[PDB]
Write a protein that binds this ligand. Sequence first.
Ligand SMILES: [K+]
Ligand SMILES: [K+]
Ligand SMILES: [Mg+2]
Ligand SMILES: [Mg+2]
Ligand SMILES: [Mg+2]
Ligand SMILES: [Mg+2]
Ligand SMILES: [Mg+2]
Ligand SMILES: [Mg+2]
Ligand SMILES: [Mg+2]
Ligand SMILES: [Mg+2]
Ligand SMILES: [Mg+2]
Ligand SMILES: [Mg+2]
Ligand SMILES: [Mg+2]
Ligand SMILES: [Mg+2]
Ligand SMILES: [Mg+2]
Ligand SMILES: [Mg+2]
Ligand SMILES: [Mg+2]
Ligand SMILES: [Mg+2]
Ligand SMILES: [Mg+2]
Ligand SMILES: [Mg+2]
Ligand SMILES: [Mg+2]
Ligand SMILES: [Mg+2]
Ligand SMILES: [Mg+2]
Ligand SMILES: [Mg+2]
Ligand SMILES: [Mg+2]
Ligand SMILES: [Mg+2]
Ligand SMILES: [Mg+2]
Ligand SMILES: [Mg+2]
Ligand SMILES: [Mg+2]
Ligand SMILES: [Mg+2]
Ligand SMILES: [Mg+2]
Ligand SMILES: [Mg+2]
Ligand SMILES: [Mg+2]
Ligand SMILES: [Mg+2]
Ligand SMILES: [Mg+2]
Ligand SMILES: [Zn+2]
Lengths: 80, 127, 98, 60, 206, 24, 155
Amino acid sequence: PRSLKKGVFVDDHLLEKVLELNAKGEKRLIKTWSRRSTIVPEMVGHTIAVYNGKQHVPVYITENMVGHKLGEFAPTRTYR
Amino acid sequence: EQYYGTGRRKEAVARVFLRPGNGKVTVNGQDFNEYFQGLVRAVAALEPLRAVDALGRFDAYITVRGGGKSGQIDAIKLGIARALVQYNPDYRAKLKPLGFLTRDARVVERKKYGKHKARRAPQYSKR
Amino acid sequence: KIRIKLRGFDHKTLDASAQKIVEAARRSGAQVSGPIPLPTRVRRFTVIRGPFKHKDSREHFELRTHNRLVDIINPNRKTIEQLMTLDLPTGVEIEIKT
Amino acid sequence: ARKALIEKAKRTPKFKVRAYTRCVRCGRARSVYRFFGLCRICLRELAHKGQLPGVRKASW
Amino acid sequence: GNKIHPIGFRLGITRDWESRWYAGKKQYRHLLLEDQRIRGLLEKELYSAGLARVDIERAADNVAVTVHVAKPGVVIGRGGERIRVLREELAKLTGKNVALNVQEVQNPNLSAPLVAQRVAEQIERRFAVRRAIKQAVQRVMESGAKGAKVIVSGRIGGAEQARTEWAAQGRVPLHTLRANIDYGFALARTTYGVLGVKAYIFLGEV
Amino acid sequence: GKGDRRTRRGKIWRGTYGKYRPRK
Amino acid sequence: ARRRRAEVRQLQPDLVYGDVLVTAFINKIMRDGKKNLAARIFYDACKIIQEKTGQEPLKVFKQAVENVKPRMEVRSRRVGGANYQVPMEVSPRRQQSLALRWLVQAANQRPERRAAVRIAHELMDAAEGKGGAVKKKEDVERMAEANRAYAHYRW
RNA sequence: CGUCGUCAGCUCGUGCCGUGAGGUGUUGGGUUAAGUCCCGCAACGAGCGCAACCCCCGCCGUUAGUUGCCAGCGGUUCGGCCGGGCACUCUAACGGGACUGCCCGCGAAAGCGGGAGGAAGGAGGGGACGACGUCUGGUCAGCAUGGCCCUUACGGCCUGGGCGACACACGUGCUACAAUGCCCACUACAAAGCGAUGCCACCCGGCAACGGGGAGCUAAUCGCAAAAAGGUGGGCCCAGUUCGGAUUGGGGUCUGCAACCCGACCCCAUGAAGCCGGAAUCGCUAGUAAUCGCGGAUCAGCCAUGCCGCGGUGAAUACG
Ligand SMILES: [K+]
Ligand SMILES: [K+]
Ligand SMILES: [Mg+2]
Ligand SMILES: [Mg+2]
Ligand SMILES: [Mg+2]
Ligand SMILES: [Mg+2]
Ligand SMILES: [Mg+2]
Ligand SMILES: [Mg+2]
Ligand SMILES: [Mg+2]
Ligand SMILES: [Mg+2]
Ligand SMILES: [Mg+2]
Ligand SMILES: [Mg+2]
Ligand SMILES: [Mg+2]
Ligand SMILES: [Mg+2]
Ligand SMILES: [Mg+2]
Ligand SMILES: [Mg+2]
Ligand SMILES: [Mg+2]
Ligand SMILES: [Mg+2]
Ligand SMILES: [Mg+2]
Ligand SMILES: [Mg+2]
Ligand SMILES: [Mg+2]
Ligand SMILES: [Mg+2]
Ligand SMILES: [Mg+2]
Ligand SMILES: [Mg+2]
Ligand SMILES: [Mg+2]
Ligand SMILES: [Mg+2]
Ligand SMILES: [Mg+2]
Ligand SMILES: [Mg+2]
Ligand SMILES: [Mg+2]
Ligand SMILES: [Mg+2]
Ligand SMILES: [Mg+2]
Ligand SMILES: [Mg+2]
Ligand SMILES: [Mg+2]
Ligand SMILES: [Mg+2]
Ligand SMILES: [Mg+2]
Ligand SMILES: [Zn+2]
């Protein structure tokens, strides 16, 4: 039962920093602190380093995860 | 012609207007039984009349506001009790002994702090 | 035919204010609607007595606001004079519409 | 109430949300009333002094 | 740690407020903060005069500040120089054309706040606490009063073991409402720490 | 019971409204 | 009750039979102060005993009660490192209490789905000398007596 | 501030007694809820506590009518709507009322039992109020404060994370295990409160949450607001079941810069444990307990089933 409304939120920090990295092909890594941002189509194929609070984690974003958030892939706590 | 009282119970007041007639009773524009739809208590309200063989010589128009049905039932009991003596002080002599003329003072006791509700105190363990 | 409102925190500051008006304009205007007592609106504050823990003590404080009406009909000429500028109560506030 | 933190007064919140109240008398953020801009402690104190007009000891 | 403020307890009767002004949920908090800010500069200034109370009446941009003191002269100044400077300092803080009456105390030995201040001072001047107390209780008892009582906190004479000195005469019924007991608290900064003075003065009843 | 959000009591208890308890 | 001896609450006569003992039984039936719901239950039962029986419900009632009152019971006590079931006579006030309580208790043990039926049957079933309410009453008396050896501990 | 504990009790002055610590008074007999009052007494009084003075509830009255009403009448779009009137109900200021005063019985008294008149009867019910002191109680993280300690960091700013981890254990609660019940209709009866960029009538759209439009109120006058338990009718028929709503999959709506960690809400699907709970243990003496719903503070929103209040229905029992 998830929901935002109308305006699939995305911090432009990386957006206009990825939609641009599309023009000159692709790239290698984009470390961000904005795990708030929603993953979107034009991200597929990229690799975003998401800060979990102590480190930036490598995340090869794929089609199957186009609707999820970035934090969802950078687990916060360390357990057993 | 007319005879008034009032009667109050658990914070519920009622206008009791007695008049010579059959036994018709209008409560907020409804038949006694129309208002007290199946509430075994009801009968009580008119008890003051039966006390003095009345009912079969009187009629009553009642207005009521505040509280709840059973509280209103009692307000009416006191109103009708007062109105009856308003029509004849000699009614006290035998109407009083049955209490009818007393206002029930007991009301919802205040909710104190530290308790769960006035008296119910919180549950404590390993004391 | 003036409608005046009298609110406050002291119930004697308003009685010595609604009558401060009526009696005056009671000899120059209509016989007035007398002072009408509008119900009060109470504001409660409940506080834990001590600074730390002890969430079972608490003390109760209320800020009750009293109200009045008066309401004199016949906005006469000799009325707005015995009144107008002869105020006294200081903890009162006044509204006027008619 | 670290002086540095009583910077709350700083309109500039960047985002209206982040703006929160604080006791105007002790800086206490944890239990401040709106109608007084005072926390439950400072409030109890001044009320006792009689410096809070109209405010009395409620009993019933 | 029991017993309520003897004043806050007596605001209904035998005791009026120190601020008489109506307000609504939109102003109250402000006219309050200010109303306080006033007592701020005031009490930090008029100290020497010996300010026992500061009533504040309001009407509408009108401020009826009434500084009560024992030495109404320290308020005024040379001819009338202070009650000019300050009276201007006030309207400077809050642009509200503020008045600023001044009253003398018919006996500063019946001003609980003062008695506290007095004793509280002697403490910083390193006096013998018990003496001060007994004395104060005397002054008050002498110049009228049906009862009186002073209380000092602890670390008396720089002692490591904080204590509490007593002293009192005549009636001082904190429980009876219609008592009319003035009360005053005086602090007491020191080379070794804080002490606390409390003054109680019982006068008349009904 | 009061814990069944798809019932009258459910809504009332949770002080909400919806299909199972619309505003009259 | 350390000071006085608590006077017994005097109840309001029945709305129908003008009986105080009825109000009691009703009260015991009642739970969560639903005196209306209570009253009805008893009454419907009265009409059920009125049908399946030719006798008047009020009288059937009285009887059952009378049959379920215990005249003896054992009250436990401490005596030199040991607890003893001391037979004790049973106070009239307490009898009526135990009787009315038991009926209702037993009644709600019955299998019949409808409340009033359960009260109905249990009540009439009681006046007949049978029923779980009466069995309790008997077990209690059997409990007492059966410890008459500890009767000298009068209490 | 908590606590012993609203438990009574803790003391002083002078006198008297004792070498002295100290004692007497405050012990004793009667009586109270009370060191409450009486009687006695080498003591006579007083202070802090009891009590009383303050608040709420219960009966009545006097000013005072933008909320009551055919009460009585004239109009009727039968809505107290309009005219009209303050009687009534209320609203809120001020007073009256109870004193063991009266009668009987018992006392020596204080008082005790009982009876009348009274709304109320012997502290009418609830609250505020908690003595000298005890716990080296609690709080240096509300604030204040002596002393120590850091002063490109033990100060300051951000972005992100954590305070929301989990094999597991306990406290306090919530919702239940059902027929004195659950569901859907229809219809009743409250009290306190809160609301001008805030309550939000009504209308339209949507299953709905909610969107769009929009009247009204500075609010006894408009809104929150439905009262729920009840009452009436109908369904379920004893089943883990039309009990119970945990968990999980979807699809949405709001607040907010932003709901992954970590929001509430709606709708569909899912439909867990649970059949009344071992040893042990908590509350409450009556409008109390038990049940039912309603408001508020904080607050954008909310993790409130928590607190703090409000009113409806309304028991059982106390030998001792
Ligand atoms: K200590
Ligand atoms: K489960
Ligand atoms: Mg209740
Ligand atoms: Mg608690
Ligand atoms: Mg708390
Ligand atoms: Mg600081
Ligand atoms: Mg905030
Ligand atoms: Mg805050
Ligand atoms: Mg269900
Ligand atoms: Mg006591
Ligand atoms: Mg002596
Ligand atoms: Mg000797
Ligand atoms: Mg000697
Ligand atoms: Mg002595
Ligand atoms: Mg002694
Ligand atoms: Mg002694
Ligand atoms: Mg002795
Ligand atoms: Mg005494
Ligand atoms: Mg005694
Ligand atoms: Mg003596
Ligand atoms: Mg310690
Ligand atoms: Mg400890
Ligand atoms: Mg320090
Ligand atoms: Mg935590
Ligand atoms: Mg673990
Ligand atoms: Mg809970
Ligand atoms: Mg629609
Ligand atoms: Mg979140
Ligand atoms: Mg199972
Ligand atoms: Mg079953
Ligand atoms: Mg008790
Ligand atoms: Mg709630
Ligand atoms: Mg909120
Ligand atoms: Mg949560
Ligand atoms: Mg809630
Ligand atoms: Zn504060």
